[PDB]
Symmetry: D2
Subunit: 440 residues, 4 copies
Amino acid sequence: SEISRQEFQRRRQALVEQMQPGSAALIFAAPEVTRSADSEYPYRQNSDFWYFTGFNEPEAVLVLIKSDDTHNHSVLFNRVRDLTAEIWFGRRLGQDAAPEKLGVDRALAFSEINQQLYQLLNGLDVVYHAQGEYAYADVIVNSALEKLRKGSRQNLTAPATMIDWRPVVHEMRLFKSPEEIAVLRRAGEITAMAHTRAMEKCRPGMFEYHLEGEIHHEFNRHGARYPSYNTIVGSGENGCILHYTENECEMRDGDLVLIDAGCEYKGYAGDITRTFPVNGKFTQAQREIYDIVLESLETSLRLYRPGTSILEVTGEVVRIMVSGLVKLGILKGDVDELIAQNAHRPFFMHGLSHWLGLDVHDVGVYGQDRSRILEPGMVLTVEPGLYIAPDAEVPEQYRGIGIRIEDDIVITETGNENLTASVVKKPEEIEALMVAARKQ
Amino acid sequence: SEISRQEFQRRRQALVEQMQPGSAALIFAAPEVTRSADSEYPYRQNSDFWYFTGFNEPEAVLVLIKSDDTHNHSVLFNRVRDLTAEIWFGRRLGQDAAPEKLGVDRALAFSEINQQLYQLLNGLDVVYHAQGEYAYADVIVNSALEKLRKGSRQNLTAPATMIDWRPVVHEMRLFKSPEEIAVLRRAGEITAMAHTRAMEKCRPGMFEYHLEGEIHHEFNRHGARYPSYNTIVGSGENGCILHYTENECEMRDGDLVLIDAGCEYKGYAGDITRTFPVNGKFTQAQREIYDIVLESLETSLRLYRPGTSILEVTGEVVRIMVSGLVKLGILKGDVDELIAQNAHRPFFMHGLSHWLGLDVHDVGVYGQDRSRILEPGMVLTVEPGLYIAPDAEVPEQYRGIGIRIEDDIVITETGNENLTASVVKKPEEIEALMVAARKQ
Amino acid sequence: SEISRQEFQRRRQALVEQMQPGSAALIFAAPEVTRSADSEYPYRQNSDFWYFTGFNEPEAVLVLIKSDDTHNHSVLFNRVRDLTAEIWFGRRLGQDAAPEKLGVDRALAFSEINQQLYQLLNGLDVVYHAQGEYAYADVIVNSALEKLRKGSRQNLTAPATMIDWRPVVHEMRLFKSPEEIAVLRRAGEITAMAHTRAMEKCRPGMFEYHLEGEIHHEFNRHGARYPSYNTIVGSGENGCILHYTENECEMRDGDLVLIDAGCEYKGYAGDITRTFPVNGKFTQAQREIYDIVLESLETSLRLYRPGTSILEVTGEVVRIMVSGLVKLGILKGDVDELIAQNAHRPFFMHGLSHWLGLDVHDVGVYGQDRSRILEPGMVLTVEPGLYIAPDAEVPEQYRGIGIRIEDDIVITETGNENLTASVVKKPEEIEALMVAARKQ
Amino acid sequence: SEISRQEFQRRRQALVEQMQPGSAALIFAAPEVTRSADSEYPYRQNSDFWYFTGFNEPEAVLVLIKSDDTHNHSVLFNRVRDLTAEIWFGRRLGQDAAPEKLGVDRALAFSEINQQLYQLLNGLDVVYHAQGEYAYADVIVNSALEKLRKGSRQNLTAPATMIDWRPVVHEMRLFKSPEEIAVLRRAGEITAMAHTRAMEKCRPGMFEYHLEGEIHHEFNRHGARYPSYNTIVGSGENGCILHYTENECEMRDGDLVLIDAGCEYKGYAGDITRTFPVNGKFTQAQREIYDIVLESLETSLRLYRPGTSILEVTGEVVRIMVSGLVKLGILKGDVDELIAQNAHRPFFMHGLSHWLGLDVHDVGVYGQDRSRILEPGMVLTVEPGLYIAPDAEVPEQYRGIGIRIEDDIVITETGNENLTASVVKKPEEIEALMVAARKQ
Ligand SMILES: [Mg+2]
Ligand SMILES: [Mg+2]
Ligand SMILES: [Mg+2]
Ligand SMILES: [Mg+2]
């Protein structure tokens, strides 16, 4: 699946729709980023710039100018073509090819932005700019506005009003189109296939990073070159560290391993977590904690639908958790009192759900305590977990267990669609999958 | 192989040896680096900071203080331990464990650096600081020195002399110790194994990125998690782009593929290039260019030794290249005149060799045109290539061919040791390897 | 005359009137300014901050918060009282005395601005801020907004809209109230008295700076301590330099001297220019140029009224100038053609009029080429001049003559009031004044 | 008196003498400084830049290059000539006239500094730069050094060593030459004449600022246009504020007035303080405090000579003060104990002496607690004072009295020369001077 030329066009028009007349919106590309000395990390475009362009070069700026309700036009600033730079670092779109390729009206050289941008903003009333996003952008925009401010005698005038477009644009990104959902559907499949493979490859004596290697390879073979975030493979006590990325330990027979990994496919993030026994067989103590987390997830998948909220579903999860922990004697006392005391917090110390899209932790307003009413087209994670510290004052058998199970969903008209259920999570199905792989 | 505690200690003492008495050297850690929104790229420590510490955290500063020729001491600033931050983002060394772990005399909290650093520099004559390396470092150091300058009444005095330690430190990094050579030897093996695997896996119809996937997996399985630079898989005309990293094309029967890839193992870079036929059989035209590049490499490996230079060996390569190209009718005229006219430059437009170590393009002074006399312990690449543009005015059969073959060497007392010859480069050996793999 | 507490209150309410509901306006004080080493220039408050406060301290910020059309409140940030700082550098208002003294609802310590400002902006829709005015202000405001932006989880929200208040505020300053006009009336008298004194004191052999000394003393004795701009005393060829401030030359019998000087009285600027003979008697050649400039001024004073513009009156001045210069043979040709060719520009190269108020070159929109229709309460200068270069190709007798004559006016319902006519400008009156003084 | 061309040359050579071979020193001009909107304060050159040039323009940089012990040369960057800018803002030296005028070898356009400076620093070992002095300077210098650092391939190398020249240069400024002493001698006379005039003009009912007006006029008439610091006229309780500059109060019969004022003559500062009765007759209570301060000054003038220190003379002053205050019953107890308890500090809370020169608070190392041994050619103030707070718990008659008496001296081979004794300080002489003036 992919995002069409027409879709990028629709998004741009949807933004312009909301802009005031006599205004321009400025959306800047991500800078290149040093890894060490003269080597740079693989380039990752700004998510918002990408959203409106699908253009993967640095030193580029989209300018959308609204004259009035029926008249608007677009200017791109981008890198000029350069034979020497392209012999070294590969091909550039240039100015001639850009209008047709990216559906913009005009394309100018980024090297001329300071000579041209103030002319585009001259006489406008409003400029939409994400102030503080990038320092190079702020310098360019402030420089433009100062020229206009100080150019009274040359009949120049600056727009007096600057508006942050991030609220508006992030509100757009919160609701996925059918194309975006199709792309996320494929990202979920690719990520699921990686997680299945890691379960099938896991043996005692392999290192945590070996499963990372397996996951990244499977991403790559379906055309998702990069992960959406740094892969987490926490075996044993490392499963209690939420964003454990060291992945440096030998995986031991008897321990669980928690894998939190997601591919980036056409810009969009998958995000799955599966926890499983390194030796293919859950112990009683491991099953006792796993079942509480699995019930939390399964109940959440039942409940998520238009008209509820992350907060409301989280309340049901907390009840399931506190009840389970009381039965194991990890918590002591009255369930409802323990709930009112937030007694689950030593063991479940993060949110159940975050928005998902072009960013793994996606943009969009949550409301207070994530109370926002859910609507169709919202995409989110469902990731309950229980993490019992090595030193927790609880029965010995539960200490140092970290379990998280995560699926990705889209809210539909009548409920949700699960994008990641192609990798197993019922414990008997996990064990059957690993047994089958160990034969072969 | 690894770098010992004692070695990090020796390096620190070797730097202190060269410092003036009444001085302090400040070596700052790399900042964390955003990939997108709240996600960061995998952390990569500053190479120079790493060189003296083997410490892989951000927000850390090594301070080496030389009182005189027999008296010196060390202070580390580093992140304080924090239960909440460590539940999320993993374990921190802290201040208590640091002296023993990293062999420093004292460790203080990075959050107190502005309250403590000026006290350490007070009354010194010289400060060694890599000015402009990092903006956060410059702010901290300038802030410290201004306090001292303005604190006459509190009996404070700033050192009046600031010296850049990068020249001195990079001169140290230029000469590898036996431990470093052993680590680079293993990086060369790991990288070689990845390149062999890519040759064995290559089939027509696979994408360029699939070989990248194979290479990265093989790095990972020997404990080199990350590449030392962004992997280059340029098939067909993409082989003419020197740092081609898009790797987005279907590999076609009839084309060559150029793979430039290197692992990062215990901080140190491998860097191998192999070019081979996608279908396992070189054409006549491909052999004709490949043989010139291979002869260049093989002759360079013969020649590199103490007492010569990259410049001197490059002159021999140019002769081999110009002679070969004249025989194919790619160049026309007298060889010696064509050499004097640099007529090879349209086809070979980069250097033959760069320093290799903690950085793939390593630190250390080259001399004018890389004329520096080579000595034992220098580590470098040998990477001749020929790149005939799709539109070059040459016989049709040579157009769009890009070939590079690269080995990594260490200069020894009597010559060089090749670190990367465990992956084949003779064409008959390449073809035999691929045939064998295709059976299965 | 002075500006009342009630007037500062009216101005604040007039600004609030124009603000959107759910907004705050931030007006910052001028920083202190180094003259050399640890000595600072006499403090000059930001004109706009002063306009709303009459408060003459640095490190202060007025915050006007509009909740809705009937509800608004004010917060001042200002320096805390400090016994040690006040023993040295004099008394501070502090927080306790500020509400009553300056008519604000609340006063907080400037040292707490970063802990308090984001709380005041939290949940607002709009912030009025003069971006780029002062770097220390921008740092404080950007810092506040970033806290709010990043504080979603703490239920913080930044205003998405930032508006420049300078256009609105400068439009207010363009129209003087009766109090402001009374203050400017007194500034005009004080400045006039200084100019009369300089004419009366001038003798051949005195230096240009001696008249500067006389002028500054007379300002001071009427309670205007500082000039509104650096005093210009250009005798001879120095009169051809428009902002000549060196004032370093001996004044010679035979030369004219041009004095451009203005006091600053209760914040408001006087601005008078008088040119006169150093020896008390105009030569024929000097009278010939002086009369053209005087006619220009006198005609302009006749013409300025509601419904005309600086541009329209300038056209009449140009005609007078070109006609006069043609009669002297300084210009050759047809008057109307010479006008169309802007042939006056080598001799009159500045504007006839600028706005006057808290700044000598006051704020307020001029329109294209100063075409804005004049209305009652606008205050402006009328300053025609002719400057014939030492090397101009004109009859010898006119070379090196610089003459400017300037009055300050307020536009009234039926014309203008001249604020500066108490110092003479008719040449016979100048000569009589100097003769009388020489007896002284 | 003035500073010769030859003297500026000697100073430059004296600096070069101390520089390392293969080095360059960079001395930047002061920036222009805004007073309000488009008006700037009178320009004041950087004292150190002035010291080596006597050049009073902004946007200028002196570069002194030492090749070795017998070879050095100078480059000036300065503003290019511009007819339009000079019609407005006066004449510029330019590049052609600068070598001869300022005795430099070469002069280049400041607008080309970024294209030229790195070429001057290329291949040098050391750069002397006053880091942090001016932000525009740091930008230029860092920019130059980064070009050199990054220009290995263009055979560029940066100096690795940066040294602050301020310590060296300020040590030079600490010792005045005969020319400088002659100029300071005249500054002392001019300042003395101003102080005499203020005493002669003072009447009850005049404002504090009126005496400021008298002082500034007298500075001006001897060719010292500007004061060296903001004039202090503290009558009554305002005399207890050390740097009182408001000067806003009516001077009342019965009160003392403290005048601290100094001219700036050819760059050099005078600094005199005289305290006297507003009505021309000291009361008993006023005489009782005045006599302690006068004895302190007179004893200090006796004592100051080579081989003592500000600290050592201050100890004698403290004894005189504590003894006097005990006799008046302002202090109670044993003199030697009260001295050991620093019991004088509520009444004398500043230093007795500061260095004087191009800055009123001049450069040069004081030593701990101003213990530095004095040598011939050091120039300093002698300014004992007693300030009894309005609310001090002391006999009523002493409350709200602030008295300071200050002379300026140069240390000679056998003692000191008083530069400011031409204005009276014995009380009977003050009273006779005012009586005589009142007749006016
Ligand atoms: Mg256990
Ligand atoms: Mg071909
Ligand atoms: Mg003449
Ligand atoms: Mg009294």
